[PDB]
Design an enzyme around this catalytic site. Sequence first.
Site, mmCIF file in Angstrom:
data_model
loop_
_atom_site.group_PDB
_atom_site.id
_atom_site.type_symbol
_atom_site.label_atom_id
_atom_site.label_comp_id
_atom_site.label_asym_id
_atom_site.label_seq_id
_atom_site.Cartn_x
_atom_site.Cartn_y
_atom_site.Cartn_z
ATOM 1 N N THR A 79 -2.788 -3.096 27.648
ATOM 2 C CA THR A 79 -2.792 -2.609 29.163
ATOM 3 C C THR A 79 -3.906 -3.079 29.759
ATOM 4 O OG1 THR A 79 -3.617 -0.647 28.306
ATOM 5 C CG2 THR A 79 -1.256 -0.527 28.731
ATOM 6 N N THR A 109 -11.266 7.701 11.769
ATOM 7 C CA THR A 109 -12.279 6.514 12.265
ATOM 8 C C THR A 109 -12.528 6.839 13.833
ATOM 9 O OG1 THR A 109 -10.228 5.405 12.827
ATOM 10 C CG2 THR A 109 -11.347 4.663 11.014
ATOM 11 N N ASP A 140 -7.838 -0.471 15.950
ATOM 12 C CA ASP A 140 -6.630 -0.703 15.085
ATOM 13 C C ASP A 140 -6.832 -1.688 13.922
ATOM 14 O OD1 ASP A 140 -5.120 0.887 16.746
ATOM 15 O OD2 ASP A 140 -5.134 -0.849 18.038
#
Lengths: 304, 305
Positions: free
Chosen positions: A44, A140, A227
């Site tokens: 995005t 995380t 990620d």
Amino acid sequence: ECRVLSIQSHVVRGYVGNRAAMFPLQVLGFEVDAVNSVQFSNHTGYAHWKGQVLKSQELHELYEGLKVNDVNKYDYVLTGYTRDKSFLAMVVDIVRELKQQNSRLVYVCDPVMGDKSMYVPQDLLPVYRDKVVPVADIITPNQFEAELLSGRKIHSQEEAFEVMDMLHCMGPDTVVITSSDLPSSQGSDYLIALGSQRMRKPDGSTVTQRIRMEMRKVEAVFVGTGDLFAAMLLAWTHKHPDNLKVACEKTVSAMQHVLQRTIRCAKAEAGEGQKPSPAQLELRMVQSKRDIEDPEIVVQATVL
Amino acid sequence: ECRVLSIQSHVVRGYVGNRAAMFPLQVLGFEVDAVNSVQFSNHTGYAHWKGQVLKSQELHELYEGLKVNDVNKYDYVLTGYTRDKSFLAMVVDIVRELKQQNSRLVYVCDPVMGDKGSMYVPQDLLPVYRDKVVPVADIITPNQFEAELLSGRKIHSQEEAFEVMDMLHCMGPDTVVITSSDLPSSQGSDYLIALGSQRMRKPDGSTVTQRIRMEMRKVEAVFVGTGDLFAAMLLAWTHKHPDNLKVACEKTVSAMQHVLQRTIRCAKAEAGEGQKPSPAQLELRMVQSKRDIEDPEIVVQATVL
Ligand SMILES: Nc1ncnc2c1ncn2[C@@H]1O[C@H](COP(=O)(O)OP(=O)(O)OP(O)(O)=S)[C@@H](O)[C@H]1O
Ligand SMILES: Nc1ncnc2c1ncn2[C@@H]1O[C@H](COP(=O)(O)OP(=O)(O)OP(O)(O)=S)[C@@H](O)[C@H]1O
Ligand SMILES: C[C@H]1[C@H](OC(=O)CCC(=O)O)O[C@@H]2O[C@@]3(C)CC[C@H]4[C@H](C)CC[C@@H]1[C@@]24OO3
């Protein structure tokens, strides 16, 4: 032999979600079952993006497809960016069932909500706080997300580690704050990441290893870095289940290699003195394969 | 450097379509833009499956999202199993536009329609593969049955097989590889015969057709996604050896043999001694074969004819 259920996004071009997670995990020897929560042309941050999102029930169908074949057996579950609370809820249900089937399963959760401002709906904060994190084993967060989850703002390293103890109490025995605003001792161009692992003695006693890490800041905005971080920390903590120091050193060194190669290539593509575009800043993951496999240690964590 | 647009299926568990294609290609140094034509829990060989199908319009949207951002620029296009004529048609339109932008784009196509006698694709697609897809394709990897379908001629001999492949060359692809055939081997009924043919244009202006035969030992199991892995690795090795089909096919086939042998060994181990491995236990051991895919030791040598 080690199978990971990764439920994350898919982009046709680029590396976010499962694109950023499955390649490193596969290359580091992990089998990966990937549920793609969305399929977009790109992430995005571009000027445009087109695609579709998966419904939570569709996710459920896929999981049941695996279950009726009796191949719903996993050592890890991995999740990240989500914008719908139905999907998060389904994820929690799946994790609960699998943990009932496998006492030792490890749920790695990146609680993506915001940075520095919230870029997901507000009604997700409760879900992460009361439903997801409690069933997580490794989280995380960044500093903003740690504060949102704990309800306490962080102004010092001591406050940060107290917040991380609160998060431990909420569930996860391993907590890494990936980015923070705390002052580095090497100047404004280095950033601080803290880590805490609550390990259990034969007794019911707790022993919390704490580490602090300083890494250089690359001067660009990247997408998918969290990620990739979460995937590689999964791998390295699996290799080093009782040494968060070593696991985090390997993870951050691999991140630094990937981001340094990416920034160099990106400003090569753009003209000299030109700010690279999001398209030009996509993580050069293919070209970083070997660095992901056996990174040269370029950061040293301090055990406190 | 080299970017491949791969439009194929996705499974949550296992290795078929993009799952069997993107990992090798990524490990061989190619950047891969992956459009997942479907998403299923697992392939159809399992007892059960569930999933969703992407529509052609959605594919078009995804490509238009790439185009609007000016990042619809590729060196390769990779396709395989599709069941919708609309989807195939869209794929052909995308290839045509990409080729108008880059005259050097190579479209690697596996025209999946059937095997052995069993067509497992709508009959609506054979006209489409013959008249629209193969014409714009540059490398194709059909099996004997598919070559016979595209050409309309039965193959009873190796010579007739190479005649069929010349007809396929005339249709479009300058490289044609028949991946499996019923032709007898000279080393035992337990070997499989694969053939290859490449039209290459000497700098003289004339063109010469390099032809090759390969005999590979059969593995006694039924695997799924072999075709996808094969086409992806052939893309890679023909990029590395654009004028030596022999070497590209040798490396492709050697990697295949390594993967399949490791897979049957691990599947026989998972199952009991004397037990038929299940479709789940026969999933390709891609991860554990990484190195064999990166630098396959040559276990088969092609015979240049
Ligand atoms: N500009 C950068 N410079 C250095 N490291 C970076 C940079 N961007 C990301 N990282 C690394 O990526 C990791 C965190 O990923 P981020 O994209 O920062 O996610 P975040 O801001 O921590 O929010 P997330 O996604 O919920 S963890 C950090 O630990 C760093 O190693
Ligand atoms: N049982 C097997 N034993 C040995 N090699 C195999 C076997 N199955 C597949 N292969 C390899 O896989 C390649 C082709 O994949 P296949 O699955 O045979 O393709 P096909 O399905 O026959 O026709 P496709 O799928 O449209 S290329 C062959 O050239 C072999 O190298
Ligand atoms: C059983 C059939 C199903 O087929 C439909 O449901 C048809 C719906 C439609 O395409 O209109 O989906 C897929 O589709 C492809 C093209 C991709 C790969 C395959 C999947 C991996 C498994 C399901 C199979 C599959 O076969 O080949």
